[PDB]
């Protein structure tokens, strides 16, 4: 329940929520499992640097 | 998380070592590990309480 919130709390850019779901704790060694990581970088924009 | 600046409040859990059910049995050379706890990894939910 608070694992895909962050998710969206993440690819969403929405950082005040961030500091919610870490400030009621999550894993983050079961969080950041590395298709999360690649699905962070995913979400990055398609005109960047 | 209520009071964002508050002090960090301070509280002892004395608990018995014969419950908790996911000891990762804290490095016997001295006692000095960071060693994570394994939360909630558990199927169980009887007299084994984390």
Same mark, same amino acid.
């Given at each position: 329940?608070?694992?895909?919130?962050?998710?969206?709390?993440?690819?969403?850019?929405?950082?005040?929520?961030?500091?919610?779901?870490?400030?009621?704790?999550?894993?983050?060694?079961?969080?950041?499992?590395?298709?999360?990581?690649?699905?962070?970088?995913?979400?990055?924009?398609?005109?960047?640097? | 998380?209520?009071?964002?600046?508050? #002090?960090?409040?301070?509280?002892? %859990?004395?608990? @018995?070592?014969?419950?908790?059910?996911?000891? !990762? #049995?804290?490095?016997?050379?001295? %006692?000095?590990? @960071?060693?994570?706890?394994?939360?909630?990894? !558990?199927?169980?939910?009887?007299?084994?309480?984390?």
């Amino acid at each position: 329940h608070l694992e895909a919130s962050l998710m969206d709390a993440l690819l969403n850019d929405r950082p005040e929520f961030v500091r919610l779901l870490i400030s009621h704790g999550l894993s983050l060694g079961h969080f950041l499992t590395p298709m999360r990581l690649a699905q962070l970088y995913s979400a990055a924009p398609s005109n960047s640097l | 998380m209520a009071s964002t600046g508050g #002090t960090k409040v301070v509280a002892m %859990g004395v608990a @018995p070592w014969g419950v908790v059910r996911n000891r !990762d #049995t804290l490095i016997n050379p001295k %006692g000095s590990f @960071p060693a994570r706890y394994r939360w909630r990894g !558990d199927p169980e939910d009887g007299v084994q309480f984390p």
